[PDB]
Amino acid sequence: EHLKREHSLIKPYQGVGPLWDFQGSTILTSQYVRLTPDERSKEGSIWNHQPCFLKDWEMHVHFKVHGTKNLHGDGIALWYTRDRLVPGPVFGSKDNFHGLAIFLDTYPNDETTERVFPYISVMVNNGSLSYDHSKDGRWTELAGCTADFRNRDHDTFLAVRYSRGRLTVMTDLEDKNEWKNCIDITGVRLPTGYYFGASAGTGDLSDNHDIISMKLFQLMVEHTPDEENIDWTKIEPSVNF
Numbered sequence: 334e335h336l337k338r339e340h341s342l343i344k345p346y347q348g349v350g351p352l353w354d355f356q357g358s359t360i361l362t363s364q365y366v367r368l369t370p371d372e373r374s375k376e377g378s379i380w381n382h383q384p385c386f387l388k389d390w391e392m393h394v395h396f397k398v399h400g401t402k403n404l405h406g407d408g409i410a411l412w413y414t415r416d417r418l419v420p421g422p423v424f425g426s427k428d429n430f431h432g433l434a435i436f437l438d439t440y441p442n443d444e445t446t447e448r449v450f451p452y453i454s455v456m457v458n459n460g461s462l463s464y465d466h467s468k469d470g471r472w473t474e475l476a477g478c479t480a481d482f483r484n485r486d487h488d489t490f491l492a493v494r495y496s497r498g499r500l501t502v503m504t505d506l507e508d509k510n511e512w513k514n515c516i517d518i519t520g521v522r523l524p525t526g527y528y529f530g531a532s533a534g535t536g537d538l539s540d541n542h543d544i545i546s547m548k549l550f551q552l553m554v555e556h557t558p559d560e561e562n563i564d565w566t567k568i569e570p571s572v573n574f
């Protein structure tokens with residue numbers, strides 16, 4: 334009914350099953366995991382070692398993006414995918430992934446966009462989609478919200494809930510200890526047996542991308558008779574039911 338330690342990244346980040354592995358620019362310190370420094374052309378990631386077999390879960394992420402007018406980037410991505418620790422151009426991680434991505438995009442690559450950044454969005458992939466970095470992934474996203482999470486003078490949190498086809502992302506960015514709406518969609522199909530992870534990238538523009546904690550909660554949810562005769566591990570990630 335509560336916190337799943339084996340799927341949580343918690344300081345001092347010395348968890349042992351080694352519960353998380355890192356690669357690229359990633360460093361561990363006693364107060365945060367820094368995926369990238371504020372230097373150009375960096376890619377870094379951290380990935381849960383144990384595959385998650387919960388159908389119904391909620392991941393809380395305490396993260397921090399910060400640096401030195403409109404000239405910073407590129408953002409963080411939070412993952413729940415079949416493959417782990419594979420570097421790539423998608424905020425540090427492979428493209429054509431299988432599963433779920435939540436992008437915390439801080440830089441408008443699309444030069445004539447009406448969209449206010451930073452922008453949070455979700456993308457579900459069965460390996461057949463490419464993330465168009467140059468268009469901020471707009472043509473492959475399912476939903477998104479504008480989110481003011483960068484350079485705040487207090488803690489910034491995100492909640493990603495997934496249960497029974499329903500994917501919710503909510504924010505806590507204004508120090509009011511309240512969740513605010515961002516994303517709420519249905520007909521999302523994902524398998525169990527995927528891995529949680531997080532990554533960030535910087536290009537010609539940079540920023541510190543830090544994860545302070547990821548806390549995975551197991552939700553107590555009733556399912557239908559029929560639902561339980563599925564091999565939930567072989568479901569193909571899918572959208573629109």
Ligand SMILES: OC[C@H]1O[C@H](O[C@@H]2[C@@H](O[C@@H]3[C@H](O)[C@H](O)O[C@H](CO)[C@H]3O)O[C@H](CO)[C@@H](O)[C@@H]2O)[C@@H](O)[C@@H](O)[C@@H]1O
Pocket residue numbers: 404405406407440441442443444466535536537538539
């Ligand atoms: O990290 C950001 C970005 O870096 C590279 O993209 C280049 C960048 O060029 C910008 C842009 O022209 C802006 O007006 O000024 C910036 C500094 O003053 C400059 O670096 O962004 C453009 C997209 O708008 C690209 O066409 C440039 O090549 C790449 O590595 C990107 O992947 C990365 O997103």
Ligand SMILES: [Ca+2]
Pocket residue numbers: 407438439440441442443466469
């Ligand atoms: Ca972008």
